[PDB]
Subunit: 217 residues, 3 copies
Amino acid sequence: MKNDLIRPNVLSVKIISNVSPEMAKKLELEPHHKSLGLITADCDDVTYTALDEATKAAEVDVVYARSMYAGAGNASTKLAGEVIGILAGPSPAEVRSGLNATLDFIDSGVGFVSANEDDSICYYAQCVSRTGSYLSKTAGIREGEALAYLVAPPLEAMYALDAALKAADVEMCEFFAPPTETNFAGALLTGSQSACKAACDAFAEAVQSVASNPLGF
Amino acid sequence: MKNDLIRPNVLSVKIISNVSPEMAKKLELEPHHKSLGLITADCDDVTYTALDEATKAAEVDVVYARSMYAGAGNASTKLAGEVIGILAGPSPAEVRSGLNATLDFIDSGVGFVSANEDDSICYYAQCVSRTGSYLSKTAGIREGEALAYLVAPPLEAMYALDAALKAADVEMCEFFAPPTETNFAGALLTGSQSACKAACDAFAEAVQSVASNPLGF
Amino acid sequence: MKNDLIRPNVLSVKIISNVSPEMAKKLELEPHHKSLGLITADCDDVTYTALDEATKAAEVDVVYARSMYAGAGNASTKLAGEVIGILAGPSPAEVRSGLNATLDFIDSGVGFVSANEDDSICYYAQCVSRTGSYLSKTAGIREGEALAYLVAPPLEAMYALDAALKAADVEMCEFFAPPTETNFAGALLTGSQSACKAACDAFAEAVQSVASNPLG
Ligand code: B12
Ligand code: NA
């Protein structure tokens, strides 16, 4: 149903202690990165936000984060979901803390929102009031600055991004050119906290407008 | 059933009348691109051909055109389909003219053709007599020159491209190495309008030949 | 159920006896490559292993080898599967010999193994005791040297790879960073024949451990 919250789900979580030198080399780990926290979920962008949140809550870095082709609905195995994230830290304790902070955020109430009756169209419009070390890097902005995290299907995203850019004083920092691996699109926008929030609102409304009138132009 | 035309479908269309400066920068639009025309459909190569036809009928450029991973049958949302196209033009009126030309072409009888009983194998063998600005650029040929637009699943495409090249007086312009995002493959071949038609016929026959005998060397 | 062999299947095979120069150029064929052997199947890594076996059986080279997005289960057409491979040789006879070695290997009993009751988790832990020209080049090792060919879903793969590297004296040759086109991951590890086998065993064990306790 419209405006329903699509609940994201963690599918698998694992810890590597004393990561082997070979794997550390290929993941380009730092010298202090001795432990890894692995996580997969059925929603990549919520997970990406949760991972960034973890870097604030613990002494961990996001060293690896990638989405799966064609999304979670097209997963061929149980634990693949549509995202894998890897946190790196100095110890299993810190990594566990990072994963816990990640899990807490994923179940915090954030998520994609339905734009129609059968939830065949959904979107993400999340204001990050204070970015951690991951999403700030990704956006090419200063750590601690705010972001509007906007995601929707390709056409809806392009249409809604333009509405968001017009609704407030925000800069497009990173463009998720369609298709992402999951066949979505969108962007990270930056500005004041209230400006980012203003962008999120305009984005949500614009997506809903397209959903209710796909062929009208 | 074999030789049945598979009807392509448009899923969504929208017009942005005054693109924001931020969006124009990420799409690398020219200063004279003021309006955008967005379109999604369940068949990418038909849409690409339609978008190219639009550049001939109106003052519009194809500034964006991408396929979705794993094709329309695997779409996770209602309007994603397997392609997004973006026309850029001087005004909403001119963009609408371009979009109308696009929609007319998609509904003109072109499309993928079934190669077997249950339509589990299909191919695209379209002769573009006079390329617009988009496919000509993509093929690296002059606007107004002819193309054989040939697409099939990976093995069929490789087998049938070879047959088309031998059967007709054409040359290779652009190779769609398997897999495309939709897990197809093919090529754009150029030559006389007659030669391109001959390439299409030989391509189609060769794909059907593989469908009827997939395991025979 | 668990430990069941997931049977791999060839979907299509064709020979191009005399490849056109236009296609030869685009595939970057060697000047002596005149014939192509095309093959598709519903399991990419088995086919890659099989194609390597072909290079030992006939005068053929692997000139093309790609996986399909989202795997065989999401194929939109009958013969696409999740892999296309292309052998190139000086004659149709060499390609035929190559393709037949490929077919026989795929049907030899090799394949992904199931990790749980509904086979919703599977993995590949193949010990290649004697690499041909294809996987040897890909791994950056000498032809004839052994490989551990390890593949599993993203998290299982990363976890099991670490276990494998610790379980035996092996070096990482190529990393299949998640996702591959099929949304899998893994690596090629090298070492002695026994060292690679131990890595396969540790990998398989580690994947099954995750399957039976994913969240924990
Ligand atoms: C077919 C072929 C072969 C066949 C020849 C036998 C046969 N009947 O099939 C085989 C597979 C044996 C072969 C081998 C080699 N060849 Co050869 N071969 C070709 C090819 C594809 C076509 C020859 C042809 O039809 N020529 C045209 C017709 C009109 O002439 P022809 O006189 O009847 O052809 C004869 C000679 O070309 C000859 N031959 C073939 N290769 C070579 C190489 C050398 C150095 C010499 C002296 C003769 C020779 O055998 C042909 C008999 O049909 C060409 C590339 C091309 N598209 O032209 C390469 C080509 C001639 N080969 C080449 C090479 C490098 C080799 C090898 C060194 C490959 C290797 N093993 O490392 C060896 C040479 C030693 C040997 N003969 O085993 C190069 C030669 C360039 C140079 N450096 O002078 C070419 C030009 C390929 C390239 N790199 O572009 N070859
Ligand atoms: Na699917």
